[PDB]
Paper text:
The structural studies herein confirmed SAV0551 from S. aureus Mu50 as a member of the DJ-1 superfamily and that it has all the pertinent traits of this group, including the sandwich fold and nucleophilic arm. It specifically belongs to the Hsp-type subfamily because of the presence of cap domain and aspects of its dimeric interface. The results demonstrate that SAV0551 is a glyoxalase III that produces non-toxic D-lactate from toxic methylglyoxal independent of any cofactors. SAV0551 shows chaperone activity regardless of active site mutations, whereas the catalytic cysteine and active site residues are crucial for its glyoxalase III function.
Numbering used by the authors:
A (entry chain B): 4 to 290
B (entry chain A): 8 to 293
The structure:
Amino acid sequence: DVNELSKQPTPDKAEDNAFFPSPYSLSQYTAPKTDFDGVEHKGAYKDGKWKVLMIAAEERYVLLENGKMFSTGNHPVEMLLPLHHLMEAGFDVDVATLSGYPVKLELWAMPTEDEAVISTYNKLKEKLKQPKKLADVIKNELGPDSDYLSVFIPGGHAAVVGISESEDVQQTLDWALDNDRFIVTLCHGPAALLSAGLNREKSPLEGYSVCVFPDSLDEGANIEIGYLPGRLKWLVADLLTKQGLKVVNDDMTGRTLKDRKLLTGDSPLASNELGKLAVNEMLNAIQ
Amino acid sequence: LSKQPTPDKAEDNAFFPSPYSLSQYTAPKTDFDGVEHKGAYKDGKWKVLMIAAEERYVLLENGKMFSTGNHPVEMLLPLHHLMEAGFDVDVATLSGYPVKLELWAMPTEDEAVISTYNKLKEKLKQPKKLADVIKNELGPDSDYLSVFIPGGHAAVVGISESEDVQQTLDWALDNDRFIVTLCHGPAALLSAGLNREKSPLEGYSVCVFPDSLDEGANIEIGYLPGRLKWLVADLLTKQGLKVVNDDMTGRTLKDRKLLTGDSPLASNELGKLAVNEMLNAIQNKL
């Protein structure tokens, strides 16, 4: 049956005392298909020059308060679905990690039976297995005349790890702000934003509005169904509020939010509509 | 029995070694048979700085990935010898990420190796960040007498093309400290050539994992699921170093303050070697 499935974290045997999410939690929070009913702007951008820069998770394991480790990565749906909208529209994509190490997907959440998500994933495998070093990106491919229109930070739980305290992410968010480019992020992806307020008395993103994954669900429901095998040592939305950001949501409804050029999503549910929002906004800003 | 690589379900198109290759290359116990200098250094100042791997997957020529890490035998057995002589160990990585081991080679029944793992589990799970160590804990008055780079196939990623590892190897030379590495660990020494016509380790002699074994036998028994994209011995040779072996016999070498071992078989004999050299250096004050 489909609620006799275990609520116990399954162990990941590549690592010591580290665990996948429970078969139950996977039965409620994943699915073979996503809620995607096609693209709005197939072929809209033609000139070829504009593209999206993705910053990505390269570390899979998140050490928790009980000493156990959660075996995560970026959420495939939250990465791959928005990118499908963009790529079909005619925006190319480059993939960077902090170190140039391979990108870590939460593969236990791959919608296996979705033509769009799997075909997009195939088109990105190379750039995923062999990303760019983001410091190499700042050095060359940014500046005022950069062909990056926006910087996309997908979610998953792994987005909490390196991405949250990185001077190279800070420098990238400084660039985006100072050249009116989009920052697109969703889920725990917003933990990236904590890097903007590093070595500083106040953040450049103070008074910005974002959808964030609610603390409640990480501190409460996710632990009780064995999605996470222990408590996180701090919470994305809590520290984002202490940096002077307006965390608009507190529930997981698929709500998206534009605010200046920081377009967000609250959860994995918002993947498809954050994809649609960003394509609209990007094509709008070309005028 | 099977030479077919075993799949790893953490990662797309990734594979552990084949259960046959595990039967030949891995064992529940190591040939450890005693420390040689327990309690020898008592003054508790001098420590050892390990630089470990954060990346466990190695992308290969066929597109498949190899699920590795540092070799627990090569990491832990040498650190046991040095810890029991009285040198504490501080673990660093490049981005501060958790240290990745090849847990399929962890000698489960070996008391000394397991004991050492538990003593470091905390420092292994939250290592220091190598660039912070550079900023704060190096210089001429640093309490690191050696820097230790264990092998495992994951030493090939990151470490081998890292300005932080480069600065670290510069320090050791310019401050007369030891560089102790084994197996595929010497791939770290390729960083000394980074952005330089000439490497400061030009001319040094080292033991490395033979090219022959990674190209032929490791592929045939399904240790590796595909061919490595470059070879550590070949690239090292090109930087002007002198690769002194072409086989795995457990050999070791000491060229000045650079101590190398050729394989996981040298783990014990090298640990022995590193403790003697370090104690001998301390005696060379008066």
